[PDB]
Write a protein that binds this DNA or RNA. Sequence first.
RNA 1: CUCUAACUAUAAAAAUCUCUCUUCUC
Lengths: 206, 64, 78, 150, 129
Amino acid sequence: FVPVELATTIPVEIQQAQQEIKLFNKWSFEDVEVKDASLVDYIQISKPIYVAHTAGRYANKRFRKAQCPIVERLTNSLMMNGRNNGKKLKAVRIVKHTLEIINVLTDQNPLQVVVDAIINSGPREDTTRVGGGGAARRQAVDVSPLRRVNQSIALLTIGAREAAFRNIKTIAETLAEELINAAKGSSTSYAIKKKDELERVAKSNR
Amino acid sequence: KTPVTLAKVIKVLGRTGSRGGVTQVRVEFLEDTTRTIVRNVKGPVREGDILVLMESEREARRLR
Amino acid sequence: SKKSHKDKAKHAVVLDQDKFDRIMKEAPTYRYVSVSVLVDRFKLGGSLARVALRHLENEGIIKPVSKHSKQAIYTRAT
Amino acid sequence: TSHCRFYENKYPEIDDIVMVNVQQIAEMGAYVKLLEYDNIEGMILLSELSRRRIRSIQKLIRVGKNDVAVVLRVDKEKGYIDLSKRRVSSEDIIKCEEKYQKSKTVHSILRYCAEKFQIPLEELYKTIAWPLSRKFGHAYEAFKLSIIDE
Amino acid sequence: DNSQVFGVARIFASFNDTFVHVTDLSGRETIARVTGGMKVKADRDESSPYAAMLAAQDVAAKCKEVGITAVHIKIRATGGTRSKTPGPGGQAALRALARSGLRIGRIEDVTPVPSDSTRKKGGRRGRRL
RNA sequence: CUCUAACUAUAAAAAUCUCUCUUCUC
Ligand SMILES: [Mg+2]
Ligand SMILES: [Mg+2]
Ligand SMILES: [Mg+2]
């Protein structure tokens, strides 16, 4: 379709009809929906971005974290445990491999899988340490949606890191299996397990 | 059973808690918006946001 | 410290004829073909996982997806 | 193989007494295995852990060893148990530990028989142990009578 | 009157372990004694509003199944010589009855009042915590 | 030259302390 005359020719799939901004020219930000209405407005699948990595002024005001690209936030939160500070390119490669795996396993256009996972892994009831001295008992509160998504993404990345540590399954594979098991109700995922523990300990200490 | 309800917060009635992290929210049930409750939220939130609850009639007092 | 793992043969590293046959047979019907996944079946130590995995690409037993180093992304050949 | 319940069902009942072993304490308390019933996990969070003020965290928990326990809630869908240790009176703890001692003693003999005949321990408990516990209140008393009366 | 089968709540609400105990309109036959401590464990939440809510729901279910539809509510503090103030669980229990189906009529305070007699517990200086 | 309404939910424990005193006048 319309091979445009250039003295420096972009390859075909990178050229033809790019009036179709997508993630990696592989996965579509269209056909992506959030199930819950609670986590919408705090998941930024609205803007299609070519790389989940962008130097944004996204920590100046109180809620500028809300409109950061969710896949970019997953990349960014992937870098943890000192030996990996900075190194955003490695995190981007890891998320790219994870996106590939999420594609080929359980085709299910991977952005939908990741958004479903973060939706179903955002804890809604937590506890605070109201106990002053004598009755050091924690009391239950409910969770703000921004806190929900942030805690879900942190739980997913920390479970991925824990699984991949000193193990033969590469961090891409571990993150992908974490996301897949989180998208379904599979209690084998670390994130869903800890989130369930949090919800249940909130229920116990209402 | 999962009797969760969605409630849109319309007012932030200040902040409370021991360390000062949890916030008062005046939520208004998305089903039958005639009813309003006050409850206690961990994490930042603005007006117009919605919340998911399991307990519905629990109008918890100020944390202290 | 002490070796509290007490694991088995820490994966097989020398190939066998039956191992060759089972890799050739079961290369499809497993959607994911990555070095760690080949290792997961206790069949492959890992050093030859990339090697045998490359050998599967001699008459298209598995099709590629990506060729980034430090991993391998292969799917069953349709 | 060492496994199987000591009492009738697999799930603990509401408002009963058990004695559990501790293996791990993460942040909210200790979710621990039970030695009076089956082998599933059940949690004690820190509020219902120490009758005295919460001063010694590891001294009173002693990871790896056994202690009296009381079950509050049961989730009869998945295998989750809510449990405590503060709420067992000084009068109670002794009967708690006596029941555990009896249950543990009856276990090993049928363990030996199951190992020797390669029969699942569940089958031996279903066949001989449970009807004895129904007849006599407890199986060890049944074996004491078996020494006396055939 | 469209045959609202009246009953009476007779809420007892102290600083400790509020009570909800429905009887007949004559105040003789018990219905749904279930108390504050029944539905809470730590014994500290005995007076907590959530305890009242849970006991209230249990009473509401039992009351609706036996046949009492409308319930007359009386709140009773500890009363006598002791502290004259309605328990914190009373409001929660009343609200919870109000929501859960059973209709409400003629709420009044029944907390007894002495003629300042039978000297109160504590001594002269009293509790000196 | 003119009028009486809004009311909440705090108590775990915390004992003791060695020198050394130096000043105001055009
Ligand atoms: Mg004092
Ligand atoms: Mg004082
Ligand atoms: Mg002295």
